[PDB]
Design brief:
part of a larger assembly; 2 chains; A: 50 residues; mainly alpha; 1 helix; flat; B: 431 residues; 0% strand; extended; transcription (chain B); sigma factor (chain B); RNA polymerase sigma factor RpoD (chain B); DNA binding (chain B); RNA_pol_sigma70 (chain B)
Chain lengths: 50, 431
């Protein structure tokens, strides 16, 4: 809506086109991470971690 | 005896059981009678000359290859045109329905029958008769009613319209009625003939259908679609070929059933070709699974189908069918999948309040700015007003100069960038 146009024009926010869908700890839970496991599809390249 | 068997399948089978099969002789008998009816209607159509005129004119207007005569079309129709034209003169020669003119008409029809006509033109010709028949009947039912009820054998007053109808038609009413009723009789014979084969072969339809019934649409839908196919096949069958009827009919029945099961039976309608590809995929997977003794990886499957890997992957993901909103997800049949699904369209009361606050704050900050600067910024971004007016419109309204508006905006940005004024707007920083 127009007011964000005005705001970005004032402050020059690029406003990139991508969301934040990360995994986070459920509220209240508090612990230690003991291991991590990664499963990749056959065609996809493997990351450094994997 | 009917035990109120409400099952529609039982009613269908009970109704179809009465008609008994007959083979190798009837099919020839009924086919002969169908062809006889069609020949009768074609002959009687050829009898009517104005239909021939109209068809020839329509041919001339428009302007299809390989006619079954027991620039090819134009040169073959040139002599037919000449014959028809020279036959018109003989009809004018000393006899309206003279035996010689009738013989010429007969030979013209004999030559004409040797050609092939597109069925749509044949229907057009039939309706060209139906329209005038209905017109003449409608304009005269009132005169017949009046002569029957009042005269019992005005008269000359009503005779004017009857004479006008003859003048418009330009032909004897009696022959028109003869040809029309002959149309009706021939068509009736043809129709009543085809019913017999159709009612005879319903069992064939049943067998072919039940071969496909394994959990598709439903039994009766398959049966009815097959019956459509059977009607088509009865239309297309020729005994002259000398083959058994079933051999021909089965292809049309399978085609109809399979085409319907492709079109319907899915909520999201996959086109036909994709259905064929998925069926190939499944037929290959079974055989390849039993050969290797396990499930085939998509790469090996792609190798066998001679298709690129991505295509196979796309088909695999497209294949799946939607899941019912009432599936019981809880072990106890109390909670259903439907209660578990969230609405996405709604916004949050938090964000609504935030938007309202933002609008108020922007209005407060803008009000503190210079009047012309404030109205310019409103006019440019469409703030508070229904639409945003472009640079040219603002220039022609306030001050023609284009670059002056650019300088106004530059100064407004400079002012609102001053840290004093912007303090509250920073709170809308993360967004």
């Amino acid at each position: 809506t127009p007011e964000e146009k005005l705001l970005r024009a004032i402050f020059g926010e690029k406003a990139s086109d991508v969301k934040d869908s990360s995994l986070r700890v459920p509220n209240g839970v508090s612990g230690t991470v003991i291991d991590v496991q990664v499963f990749t599809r056959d065609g996809v390249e493997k990351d450094k971690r994997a | 005896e009917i035990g109120r068997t409400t099952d529609p399948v039982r009613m269908y089978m009970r109704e179809m059981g009465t008609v008994e099969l007959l083979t190798r002789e009837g099919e020839i008998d009924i086919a002969k009678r169908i062809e006889d009816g069609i020949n009768q209607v074609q002959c009687s159509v050829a009898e009517y000359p104005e239909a021939i005129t109209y068809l020839l004119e329509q041919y001339d207007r428009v302007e299809f290859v390989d006619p079954n005569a027991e620039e090819l079309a134009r040169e073959k129709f040139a002599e037919l045109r000449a014959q028809y034209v020279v036959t018109r003169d003989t009809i004018k020669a000393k006899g309206r329905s003279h035996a010689t003119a009738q013989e010429e008409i007969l030979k013209l029809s004999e030559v004409f029958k040797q050609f092939r006509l597109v069925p749509k033109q044949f229907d057009y010709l039939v309706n060209s008769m139906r329209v005038m028949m209905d017109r003449v009947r409608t304009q005269e039912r009132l005169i017949m009613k009046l002569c029957v009820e009042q005269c019992k054998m005005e008269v000359h007053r009503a005779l004017q319209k009857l004479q006008q109808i003859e003048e418009e038609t330009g032909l004897t009413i009696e022959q028109v009625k003869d040809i029309n009723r002959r149309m009706s009789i021939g068509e009736a014979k043809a129709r009543r003939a085809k019913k017999e084969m159709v009612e005879a072969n319903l069992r064939l339809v049943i067998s072919i259908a039940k071969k496909y019934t394994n959990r598709g649409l439903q039994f009766l839908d398959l049966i009815q679609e097959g019956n459509i196919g059977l009607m088509k096949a009865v239309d297309k069958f020729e005994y002259r070929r000398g083959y058994k009827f079933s051999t021909y009919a089965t292809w049309w029945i399978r085609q109809a059933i399979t085409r319907s099961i492709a079109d319907q039976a899915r909520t999201i309608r996959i086109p036909v070709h994709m259905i064929e590809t998925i069926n190939k995929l499944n037929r290959i997977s079974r055989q390849m699974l039993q050969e290797m003794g396990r499930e085939p990886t998509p790469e090996e499957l792609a190798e066998r189908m001679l298709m690129p890997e991505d295509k196979i992957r796309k088909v695999l993901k497209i294949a799946k069918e939607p899941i019912s909103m009432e599936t019981p997800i809880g072990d106890d049949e109390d909670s259903h999948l439907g209660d578990f699904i969230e609405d996405t369209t709604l916004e949050l009361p938090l964000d609504s309040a935030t938007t309202e606050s933002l609008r108020a704050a922007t209005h407060d900050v803008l009000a503190g700015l210079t009047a012309r600067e404030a109205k310019v910024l409103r006019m440019r971004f469409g703030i508070d007003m229904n639409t945003d007016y472009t640079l040219e419109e603002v220039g022609k309204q306030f001050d023609v100069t284009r670059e002056r508006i650019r300088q106004i905006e530059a100064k407004a940005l400079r002012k609102l960038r001053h840290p004093s004024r912007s303090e509250v707007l920073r709170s809308f920083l993360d967004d």
